[PDB]
Every structure is written in C-alpha cells, then in structure tokens.
Design a binder for this molecule. Sequence first.
Ligand SMILES: OC[C@@H]1O[C@@H](O)[C@H](O)[C@H]1O
Ligand SMILES: [Ca+2]
Length: 303
Amino acid sequence: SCELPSTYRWTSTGALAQPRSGWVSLKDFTVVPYNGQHLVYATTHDTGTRWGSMNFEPFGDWSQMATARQNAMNSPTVAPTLFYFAPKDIWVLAYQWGGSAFSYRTSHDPTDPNGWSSEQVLFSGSIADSATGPIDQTLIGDDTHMYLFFAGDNGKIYRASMPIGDFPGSFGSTATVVMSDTRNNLFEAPQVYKLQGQNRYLMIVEAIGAQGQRYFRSFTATSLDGEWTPQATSESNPFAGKANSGATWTDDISHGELIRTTADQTMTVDPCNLQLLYQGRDPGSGGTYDLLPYRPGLLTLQR
Ligand SMILES: OC[C@@H]1O[C@@H](O)[C@H](O)[C@H]1O
Ligand SMILES: [Ca+2]
C-alpha cells in the first residue's frame, strides 16, 4: 500500500447536498458501500430545537447525492455509525442520546430508515469532567475483539472492548482513556480505521482551531488495544482542515467519515485512495451552534 503522508494535500468538492425542507443541517455522516453504491446516514436538525436522523437513498456517484431522496428516521439516531457485522450477518446502527450513553439497533436492510430494531444498550458508562458525557462513538473489530472509541468534548479519547463473539451487545460501563490533551485538541468526532495493506490503524479526531475553525488531527496504532502515535497533529499541518482542504465554501472540516473498502466491522480504508466525507458550513454563518447550516462535502487526497 501507500504510506500515510506526513503532510496531507486534498482537493475538495463544494456542498454535495442541501437539507430537505424543514431541516437546517445535515451532519455527522456515516457512509458504507452497499451494492456498488454509497449508503449514507446523517444527523439532522430542524429550524427550532429538534435533533433527528436520516438516510439518503443509495446513490452511485457523488453528483447524485444532491438529488437522492432524503428519508427521515422515525426513531432518532444522532451521530450514527453504520456497519455490517459479518459474524452474525446483521447490520448495526450505533448512536447517542437514547436511553443510555450509547445505543444500537440492528437490521437486515440498512437502506430502510424505519426498519431498525428496538433500541439496545451499547454503553452505559459515565465520564468525569465532561459537559456532554460520552459523545460520537465509533466501532471497529479485528479478528478477536470489537472496540468502542468515543470522546467527551473534554480533551480525552476513551476505549472499551469485548470479545467479538459477544457482539452485538453492551460494552458495559467502563472505559479506558487512551489519549488526553486540551479540550480543543481532542474535542470530538473520533473515527478509527484499519489501513488496507498495512499493519496499522488510523484514528482521526476533530479539534477546534485558534479562531474556532474545526479540523482533524490524525494518530496511528499497530494494535487496537495499543498506544496511539501522533501522525498529523496541528492546525497548520492537520490531517484535514482549512490549511490543506482545497475548500473555499467552508472553513470547517468537521464530523464525518472516510470512504471504506468494505461495509463490515473491520472498518478498512484504502490509504492509496483516502477520501473524507465531512460536514462544512458557509464561513459567513453564525449564531447558535445547533442551528448552524452544515452540509456534506468530499475531500480527495492528492497523490
Ligand atoms: O450533531 C450533534 C453533535 O454536535 C456535535 O457536537 C457532535 O460531533 C455531534 O454529536
Ligand atoms: Ca461519527
């Protein structure tokens, strides 16, 4: 494969879709390959105070995201993570702000926004020193374990694990801090992937920059239960940010996901073809955080 660069350079699209009437934003994207198409779920917010979730109809190419039907979910699954859990031939949708810290549901047809099972507990722990509590889960498995990573809007990244044979189920109520920094440097939206062709995992984490602009920092590990090493960890030399995105429609490069080689729990990405589906917003936007007009965009790594 292709080693991660020490300096990332991207090109970007503009906004790839506008929210369906009634929503002010589309956020926190999760995306899988599904029958040769892209299947995307997202957080929504309306014009008042309501968070929700949605999926898009599957679409073939990124120009079709703008016209793909946007399907409200009748059960809100904010900041979702979608994947196929191969060992039990079942799809899993993990999320937050349900009945415990994190939740999940299952389905045999992930294109159906309303086909998910009743809510199941994914994590029932609490964390110290956090205004939000646990936020922005992500999940990944290797040959023997499933792993849960999450943030706390507090400078820490947390990890829990279970034997893969016990999944789907709850990770319990305890977690291990695997990294800590200032609140702004390890803020939220972690995503963890296996790099195809390398004995290496990639973690990206959203950070808040010096003028409030959102960007991503990257870290690597050789084992999911091992230590993380800074890979691109400043605003001027980020994994992805205003410094290197090639995007003018947005300064923020915020909560999203890399395009994967598989839908399943191995969370594999091709380091020769990194692409980031992120949320961005017009630099002229402002006002209360919850009403910010986020939209999807796509970065393609230059090589
Ligand atoms: O979009 C809802 C939440 O806002 C942000 O703080 C999070 O990354 C996400 O969990
Ligand atoms: Ca996420």
